[PDB]
Design a protein around this ligand. Structure first.
Ligand SMILES: COc1cc(=O)[nH]c(=O)[nH]1
Length: 148
């Protein structure tokens, strides 16, 4: 395929959101924020990457039945930022992202990809900041990229 053929390094995480408004804001301003635990997981992966490869994020709104696109993580986490900018006050902090695809892809197109690090559960059954093994992540990314 033409998409993601060169991604020898780097790491891929599921992002789950309770709020489609939060996603809209993320797309508009190219920023995101997770829980404290999820921020720490993404921060560790971004920093240990040391710019050697991409950290990609596969976004999905809880209950929507579809993934809604792909962004690249673009900064470390900043834990002390303006409160109350998201749909709930409980999302504290900020990191930069760069959205690559904004498009709805039905879970039917992805649910036969299983995560060997998550009890072989479908990737579509992941929780927020579930890490995706690199070879399964390539499959997901190419399906999203090419979907029509
Ligand atoms: C950044 O805004 C959100 C982050 C999250 O992890 N879940 C949400 O519903 N919104």
């Amino acid at each position: 395929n033409l998409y993601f053929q060169h991604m020898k390094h780097g790491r891929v995480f599921i992002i789950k959101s309770y709020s489609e408004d939060d996603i809209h804001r993320s797309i508009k301003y190219n920023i995101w924020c997770s829980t404290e635990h999820g921020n720490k997981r993404l921060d560790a992966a971004y920093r240990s990457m040391n710019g050697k490869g991409p950290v990609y994020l596969l976004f999905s709104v809880n209950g929507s039945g579809h993934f809604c696109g792909v962004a690249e993580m673009k900064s470390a986490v900043d834990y002390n930022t303006c409160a109350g900018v998201w749909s709930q006050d409980k999302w504290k902090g900020r990191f930069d992202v760069r959205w690559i695809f904004v498009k709805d892809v039905p879970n039917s197109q992805l649910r036969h990809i299983r995560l060997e690090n998550n009890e072989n559960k479908p990737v579509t059954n992941s929780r927020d900041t579930q890490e995706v093994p690199l070879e399964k992540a390539k499959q997901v990314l190419k399906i999203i990229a090419s979907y029509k």
